[PDB]
Amino acid sequence: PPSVFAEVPQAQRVLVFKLTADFREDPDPRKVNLGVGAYRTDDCHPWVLPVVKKVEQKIANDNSLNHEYLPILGLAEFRSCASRLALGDDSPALKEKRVGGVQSLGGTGALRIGADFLARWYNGTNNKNTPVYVSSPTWENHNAVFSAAGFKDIRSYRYWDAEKRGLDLQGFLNDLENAPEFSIVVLHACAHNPTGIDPTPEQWKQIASVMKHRFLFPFFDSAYQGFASGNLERDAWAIRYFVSEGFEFFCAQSFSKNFGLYNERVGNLTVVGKEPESILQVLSQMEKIVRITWSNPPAQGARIVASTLSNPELFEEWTGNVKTMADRILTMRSELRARLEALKTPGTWNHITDQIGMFSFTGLNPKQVEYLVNEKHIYLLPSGRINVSGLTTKNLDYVATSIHEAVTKIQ
Amino acid sequence: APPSVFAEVPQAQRVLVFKLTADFREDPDPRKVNLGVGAYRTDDCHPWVLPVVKKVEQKIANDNSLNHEYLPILGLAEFRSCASRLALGDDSPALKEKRVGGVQSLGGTGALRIGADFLARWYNGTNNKNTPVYVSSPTWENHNAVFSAAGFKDIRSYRYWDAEKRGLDLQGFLNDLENAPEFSIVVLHACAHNPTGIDPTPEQWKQIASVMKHRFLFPFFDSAYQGFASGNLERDAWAIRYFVSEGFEFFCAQSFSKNFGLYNERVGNLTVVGKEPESILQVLSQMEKIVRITWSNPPAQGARIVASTLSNPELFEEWTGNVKTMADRILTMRSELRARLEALKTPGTWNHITDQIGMFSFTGLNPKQVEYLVNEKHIYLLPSGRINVSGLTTKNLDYVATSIHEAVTKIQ
Ligand SMILES: Cc1ncc(COP(=O)(O)O)c(C=O)c1O
Ligand SMILES: Cc1ncc(COP(=O)(O)O)c(C=O)c1O
Fold first, then answer.
1. Is B258 a catalytic residue?
2. In CATH, what number does B77-311 get?
3. CATH hierarchy code of domain A76-310
4. Are A46 and A40 in contact (CB under 8 A)?
5. d(CA A376, CA A364)
6. Is A108 near ligand 1, meaning CB less than 6 Å away?
């Protein structure tokens, strides 16, 4: 009698995971990991935000708190603070009570329960054939999350232009123009992962024009608000524009990066509708999905975010911490670009500073990446994506020289 | 203007406890009692943060070396091994033989969901959504929903509660297992059956295991009350550990919501026991894929509290003392309620009040009798007759017992 698990195969390995394992085992003293999936300081360390440390101390010393179940949809002050952060204090959607918020297990959890809701209630009853459009390329897990919710038809829209090292707007618009009516479109609100290149506001207006015409459902992924540029309002421009254009949409918010709270799993699904009463019905269906997935959400991370966003002094301290990370990212991009151009590297390198956020498509091809990894011990994905916060004052000259060698030696 | 894309979304109905609690809240009658809270409450009707949890929370807050970087997908390693070791026992042969895996999950619900998702994909075939899933009659209100969300199309009941004798219908239970198709999944309450409170005895568990072994039934244990149920961690895990020694492969969804009082930190563990070490590693690799598309990786704070407690002998002993305090109060409320009903010469028998264990009790009242308690005496409980025993207090015990006496004598 064989094990009931005897035929269970070994799951496919994750590229990022193996890359970091390879870096860890590398004895070369020049090695650099540009494939970390989180913010790191100039000393290659994690950074707990000072405001988070401060609030955690307050929480630990607050004997009025208990551990009883949160509401299914989550902590009320977190949900309202989170949605207001995305939409702005003066949002007409908030004033008109057309907004709901579901606390979730990070951005991933928000995407999941939103996809589960759409797969049951959107565009008909249990309609799993609604096309879901993701960017080419996109965050690895987008396809997997929507597939897990049951969607049978995941498609891509053109986005990264590898020749221009920038946004292929014409291809993006043409793919949307050919999307079946009511298709779901997964949009990066700001700091596109993995490329770092965002549509400009003028480009967003062209994108919204096609989506409005073909009744496409925007599903925003907002994982980097404030973290991307240091400016919360600017990083929310596209979301707030879609509000004012009258779209109904979902917005999956993560607080993993902009609060540094990765392992407390703090997210919010913001829902924007045309009318207040059906938003309440959406929320009641979201409760059913939550109850059969994680029952109700954890308190610690949401309590930190809610306390920060609702205290004006903590809020201003937080914005300072976020600007510290955004400023470091900005500086590493400027310094890498400057050194590449000083070395007379072929090609253009303004994309390094045109992009925003912690991830950058360098424009290197897989053979050039293989040179960096194998001969220079600089670890990055074959896609050419780097974590810009993996660059430091101490390794910048080595990384820029190695990229110069990769570009000049390898076609 | 065109209609909202949400215009046809109907209102979902909320769980019975929400309405019961709002009705209680809005009741102006000063004698009112809420016997339908879904968590432990003290003799003063308040929540209880365990002292050991307060102490460990201080330790965590003062540990400057902790960061917030993503945990591994399967969770905090020290929590997973401590949780599985808590359920299986330090000297478990499965642990020594490396036949065990553990997945940190979002409470017991999250563990049930991940395990159900795995079974719906890899067990009894590939993508077999037709494997029958058996749950007790009655059972925890979300068992059906969780396995249905995993895709299972055939969710069945096994007889369990006998309303006439106020106890376990072991013969009906065993006959339902005998007729189950081979490889059917059976969701078993490890201890402190929810909602009834009545558990199989160890000798009754041996008969259950015999049928399940003969019919190749898959045990999916729900272990939400270990230690909390009786105050003794070893006794509360006896059924699980007997299934290990009988050679079963199985899942066990563990919750630390009750026995640590960490309800809102969502601390659970899915323990997997298999025949062979290397297929367990492949099971875990598939659990990672499922976690990745559900919550990506699990939260740290509650797991850190449990891990810190279970890995330190001094904290573990404080914790077991705290757990015994809750178990002893529940045990006392049961004994006092029974003694008061028998002193009032209440018709029927009432040893089921003390035969049951854990926070929840099927009182054996019928819906007409419950309706009296709610409408006339303002004692709030579910139409099934389930009460939360920790809703009883030294102050309300005579009013509740007197009211149950009235209900039983006035209404047939
Ligand atoms: C675009 C994008 N979506 C979703 C996520 C997942 O975030 P979380 O870890 O909060 O689930 C990430 C990273 O935070 C991301 O970059
Ligand atoms: C039998 C049973 N299973 C599962 C659960 C769910 O536990 P959690 O809140 O940790 O998800 C409960 C909690 O009381 C329960 O009683």
1. yes
2. 3.40.640.10
3. 3.40.640.10
4. yes
5. 15
6. yes
